[PDB]
Amino acid sequence: QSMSVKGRIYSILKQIGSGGSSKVFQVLNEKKQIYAIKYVNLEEADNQTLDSYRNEIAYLNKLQQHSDKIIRLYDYEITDQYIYMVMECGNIDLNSWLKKKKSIDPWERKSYWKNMLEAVHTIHQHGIVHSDLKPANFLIVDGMLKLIDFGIANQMQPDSQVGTVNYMPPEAIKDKISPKSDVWSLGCILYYMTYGKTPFQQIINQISKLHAIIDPNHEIEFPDIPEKDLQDVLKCCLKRDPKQRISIPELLAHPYVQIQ
């Protein structure tokens, strides 16, 4: 099987992602270099949808200059029928990798944290708030994490999380949305990387779950662990009041990412 994009031919090794109307393929080009290609069929896309796509793409293409913790987009072709995006290929996404994993090296955890902070900080500096961060938004590429999307393109549905509520901040439920909202969600991802679950994972009922998330009389548990700085990061990211919640520039100066 094969594909053409801006005049260059790519052979398909396998499919590494799917969707109703979208696929991601691992591929090789004419020089035997490997890449990932996202394909989007526009057949049934309305104008608002289309504009959400073009906006996500414009941002990806822009923000590439600004951080190597954003996935590399080398090229794209777009027509009225489809989109093809040629990207660097990662090894696996963070969600899949977390599920495959029984314990995480503290050093590796701290290193991924920093990467996530950096990428999210970068989008905040261009006025983007993702507001739906989750492990699937991050990709392992050469033992670094890279953010792959900005929360702008309309989402859909045909390893998997989407419409999930476990990372949703309290003020997204009540609904205002600020950069602080993305801190909660990163906080939830860090908590999963620390304790093996998300902070409200055990509450099965979705409505009970949402109620617990906004209820300040519901205490979140932070079992003691040998890295006290990690435990303080979690406590600080997961304040329900956004005005109380630590900020990204603060988290980047925190002893958890700075010390040793």
Ligand SMILES: COc1cc(S(C)(=O)=O)ccc1Nc1nc2ccc(-c3ccc(NC(=O)[C@H](C)c4ccc(F)cc4)cc3)cn2n1
């Ligand atoms: C072998 O590699 C693997 C394996 C396994 S797996 C199956 O092991 O779990 C898993 C992963 C990999 N690799 C991989 N490499 C890459 C590179 C890039 C992307 C990627 C990048 C950006 C997006 N962006 C969007 O979808 C956004 C929302 C968008 C943008 C424009 C639109 F028109 C519409 C939507 C989507 C996908 C994903 N992967 N995934």
